[PDB]
Design brief:
part of a larger assembly, 2 chains, A: 50 residues, mainly alpha, 0% strand, B: 55 residues, rod-shaped, nuclear protein, Dam1 complex
Amino acid sequence: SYADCVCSLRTSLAFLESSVATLDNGVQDFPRLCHVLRTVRHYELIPQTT
Amino acid sequence: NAFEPAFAELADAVADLEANMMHFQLMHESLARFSESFASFLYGLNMNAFCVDFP
């Protein structure tokens, strides 16, 4: 029982580590653009012609 | 009396002119619609930029 538990749980954590690792390699650039667009977000619109 | 085939040639020339002029009219209308779409497109683009000009 415990053998299956440790092996399977270890594999689970390993794949979770893989998940987060690839996510680091593929999402780490977002905060830059997030800060950028947060600075760009100042929007207000009143159509003078309408 | 003197320019019978000459006027026949003129009839042919004006027919060709009618063809080319119809193509001009049509194609100019096509370009007018094209230009109007792109004009209103970039117009509204400028309007958005004119209203909320980013940093």
